[PDB]
Amino acid sequence: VPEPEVVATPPADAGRGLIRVDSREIRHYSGTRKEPDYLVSRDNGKTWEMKAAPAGYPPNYGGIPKESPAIVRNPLTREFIRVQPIGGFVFLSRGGLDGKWLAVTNDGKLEEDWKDPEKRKNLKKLGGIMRTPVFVNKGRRVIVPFHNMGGGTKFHISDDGGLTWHVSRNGVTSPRHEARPPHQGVRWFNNAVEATVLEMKDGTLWALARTSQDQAWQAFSKDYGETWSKPEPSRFFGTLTMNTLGRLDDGTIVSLWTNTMALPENATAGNGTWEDVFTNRDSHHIAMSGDEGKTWYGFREIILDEHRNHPGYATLDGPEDRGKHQSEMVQLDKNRILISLGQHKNHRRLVIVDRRWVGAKTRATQTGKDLDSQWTIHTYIPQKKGHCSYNRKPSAELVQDPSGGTKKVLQIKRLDDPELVNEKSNVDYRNGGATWNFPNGTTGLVKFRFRVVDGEQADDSGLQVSLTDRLFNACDSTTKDYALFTFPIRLKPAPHLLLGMKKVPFTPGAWHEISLLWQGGQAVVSLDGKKAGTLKMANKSPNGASYIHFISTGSQPDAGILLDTVNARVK
Amino acid sequence: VPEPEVVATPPADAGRGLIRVDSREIRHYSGTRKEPDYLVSRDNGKTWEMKAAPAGYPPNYGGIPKESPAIVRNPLTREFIRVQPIGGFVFLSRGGLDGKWLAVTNDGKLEEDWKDPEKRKNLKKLGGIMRTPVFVNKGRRVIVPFHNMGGGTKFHISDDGGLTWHVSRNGVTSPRHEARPPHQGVRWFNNAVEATVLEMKDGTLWALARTSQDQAWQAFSKDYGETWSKPEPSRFFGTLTMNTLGRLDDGTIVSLWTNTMALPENATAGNGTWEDVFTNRDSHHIAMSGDEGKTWYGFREIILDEHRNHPGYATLDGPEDRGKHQSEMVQLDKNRILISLGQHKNHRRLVIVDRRWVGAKTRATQTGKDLDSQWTIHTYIPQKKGHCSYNRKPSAELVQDPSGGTKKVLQIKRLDDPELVNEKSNVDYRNGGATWNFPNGTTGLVKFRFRVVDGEQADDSGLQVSLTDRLFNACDSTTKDYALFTFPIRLKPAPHLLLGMKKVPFTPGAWHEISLLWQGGQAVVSLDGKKAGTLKMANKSPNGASYIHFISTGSQPDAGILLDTVNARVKL
């Protein structure tokens, strides 16, 4: 099955501006303040180059330099509508993207002479931070989600193709974060911002929005966006990152988001007006549904941020927002989807995924071979740098397999590194760890191979092993508290698994395999091919397991454990 | 970055008398024949009011009512020297402008009792028409340029702070103007007069002087003013108007002048002893150099004369010399410069400019909005009035955009106005036109939008479009002969551009955009975004292009063309 393939870097942060022109040409526009331009592919997304837009295409009067306007085709007229992420005007095409453009006036007319600054004074200016215009109701209505950070999302609505506009009666909201353990402070408050909208087969609109909770929240409309239900938690985990919904030609729904859990808030997190530090923006994920959202599959990592481990992460090539959050998609053919994702010129990417890979039931890995592409291992230097960022270090390193040969394996231990401690913000990220994604399953079997390091160990040394439903940081010791299933490997007095109350001893200084076969609310744990015990599920999930998470447990520097292979198969 | 800002009217014509007192106080003295006075700002140039000078400050024994004495601070003693534009005495201060003043005697002493008429008979009297004392050679020498109208510039030199004086061996001269076409007569002869002097980094002195040629002329001294090189044309275009050079705190050189070309001389211009009529004094310009004059930028219009279009220009509130020629400068801070400029109470101004505006690389305009501030459009009623002046009319007028809406656009046509003709002096200023400044560039891109008026046209109707290196009058049909690049838009037999030998048709009844992209000795011309042709440079420039000039070409009354926007970008 074809793995995700990076094909280009878009010329703006992802989420707006990616637009199919025809069966072979796709463009990604930009937020340039100069003469407008775009990145273009003429081979259906495989190769790309920059090009200047023609003279009839309007400059970015609104928007910001790092984000393109959203550009959307009207399915009835086959023309395009363009709005900015913020500010500026509503432009409609006549003759396509390379034809004439007209700006919408306050009185519902079209202005051809928008190069005249006097004539721009009477142009319609839609308010708020906007996302993507979406045509609904057999193309007869267009709605544009917009938000205020603390006020919530509402919708700009037009019933005449964008000539005249009204605002929905209500929209989407979500509650403030409540500081309770393990948090020592409050998350940045976003009130159901950055909504994405999908029309369902029964005509309902589903709005999915970014929140300060552990998951995105959602609401529904029965009147094409004029009024919306009470909001509620969605099944898509994630916090303060963006969701995008789409639909393939065959009706399959695609959900793109950053399926992560941030680190608990620290003791200097601020009052929640703005963010203190981002600890959850280094991946992007995909899931699909063939039955109108009744069931979902996939929950696969599209990509991990290539810079995630590095001690200069926060400031390399300018401090602007960075990572793998935000996305937009264009279907390429029956199997392939093009995704623009991420923020910052060193991080944002155009990636081709294959739905057959989304639907796969197995995955395997070896830490020595696959660390850079597949393994989340970063810890943080807890000193805020750049714009709401931390620099990182790898929390674990590859070492020679003590059995000999050429294998390299991952040493997971409690680190002797004072730089990973901030006493004022009261955080200590010295426990090394590692986490790895696999296709989601409510029933599955995961096997991993590990070895106790021949070295000094602390009284509490070992490894907490968890199955989770989103990506928890490698250094997050609270993962077990949210996990679907979790148990410790304890090294002292002698090595053993603790499965409920049962202790299962095993030898140090030798490779061993542990299997977890989970189904419903129970997991059976095996050691070297022999049933060892069972685990009761610690937390229910709306989706199932899609990560295994390993973190050291020692509270003083130790030698820890080595991790070799992991494989997973789901039902 | 602010555009130039008028802040006051000085109490004398510009060029002498503007003097910084301290970090916040600046004064402009006057030529009053009564008790001396000055205009003063106590907020570093922003606001101004008149004040009487204190009792120790001498009256203007020399000079003339419309000009202040020059006042200059000695950088070593921190005291001041004062000389008149003509006549009078040499005064030195002891205790500053509001302290004691002493007059220099013929025998190199200082007279304290200059209020006594008897004692004034033995005071030193420097001859000629004098400009500004300048201290050179680490402040150890002071020199004062002086001239005779037909004899040339020389320098009064003192090596003891103004106590004793000698004259330079030579100075600056410049040739008489020659009456060759398009002239029908000779320009007023001035022999390198009104010099301004700047000390260069290497100790050379540069003198820049007003002439009867198309540009100021210059000469150089290697001995702090005793002897001067042969004279030569300078890079600063202009005729029979004043130059001023100065240097900012950071070493940047500033050149202020009137960057214009006068109309060709007419058939009754006289023998050149004195002027017949001034046709080039309605603007002032600035340029700067950070590399001791090797490279210059700016060439921007500081201001246009607000009265320039009017049919009573020559006589309003008295006929004395008027316009925007003559200037003097005082730096205000790192970015801003105060300039006194012009002549006549209704015309002379104190203006603050910003060096970041001087260094800008773009400008844009729309005729209907910007005509009064930015567009030179005047034609002349060719009847001499007042003192060497013509009354004017606007040669082009704003009309409704035919596309509809509130936009106004400028109609440029051959006028039916016999008042614009003088058959004895043989001039006919009935071709309307318009010209607009932009920052200098040896490379650049200028775009303008035009449309043919729906009306009857003559066989030669159209618009001659020129890029120039100084301001040519709106009604000057010879501009094309001096232009860096030029070409005609012709309306008959059908509308077309003529680019060399290539005819490029365009439609009537619609707006069109022409682009001119120049580099070196060629300009690429585009029409509505499509390359149309090329133009070879018609005349080289020492500086580059800083004006676009549009003039009607019809020789009988016609409907002409409309002009909407122009924009410019240089240093590509």
Ligand SMILES: CC(=O)N[C@@H]1[C@H](O[C@@H]2O[C@H](CO)[C@H](O)[C@H](O)[C@H]2O)[C@@H](O)[C@@H](CO)O[C@H]1O
């Ligand atoms: C436009 C701008 O500079 N805004 C500043 C910052 O705004 C936002 O910060 C959040 C995180 O809190 C997020 O990264 C947004 O993308 C970003 O625009 C923010 O630093 C704020 C802090 O007081 O100041 C704003 O001016």
Ligand SMILES: CC(=O)N[C@@H]1[C@H](O[C@@H]2O[C@H](CO)[C@H](O)[C@H](O)[C@H]2O)[C@@H](O)[C@@H](CO)O[C@H]1O
């Ligand atoms: C002092 C005076 O009245 N001078 C007369 C005039 O002199 C000068 O004229 C030139 C232009 O020719 C210029 O305008 C000077 O500023 C001005 O002083 C001039 O009219 C001259 C003509 O014969 O007679 C002078 O007496």
Ligand SMILES: CC(=O)N[C@H]1[C@H]([C@H](O)[C@H](O)CO)OC(C(=O)O)=C[C@@H]1O
């Ligand atoms: C106009 C603006 O600020 N857009 C920003 C948006 C906004 O801050 C958030 O939606 C809360 O309002 O989020 C961020 C972000 O990476 O957090 C990137 C966008 O550029």
Ligand SMILES: CC(=O)N[C@H]1[C@H]([C@H](O)[C@H](O)CO)OC(C(=O)O)=C[C@@H]1O
């Ligand atoms: C004493 C005197 O006449 N000074 C005049 C000066 C002089 O005529 C010229 O320098 C040729 O000598 O020029 C003029 C002028 O605007 O032309 C204004 C001065 O008041």
Ligand SMILES: OC[C@H]1O[C@@H](O)[C@H](O)[C@@H](O)[C@H]1O
């Ligand atoms: O989760 C509750 C929601 O479930 C959806 O299937 C339905 O379309 C919504 O109207 C709402 O009932």
Ligand SMILES: OC[C@H]1O[C@@H](O)[C@H](O)[C@@H](O)[C@H]1O
């Ligand atoms: O234009 C010629 C002049 O160039 C100057 O740089 C130099 O100082 C003068 O002495 C003279 O050579």
Ligand SMILES: [Ca+2]
């Ligand atoms: Ca936070």
Ligand SMILES: [Ca+2]
């Ligand atoms: Ca003359």
Ligand SMILES: [Cl-]
């Ligand atoms: Cl960018």
Ligand SMILES: [Cl-]
């Ligand atoms: Cl816009």
Ligand SMILES: [Cl-]
């Ligand atoms: Cl499909």
Ligand SMILES: [Cl-]
């Ligand atoms: Cl006066």
Ligand SMILES: [Cl-]
């Ligand atoms: Cl005097």
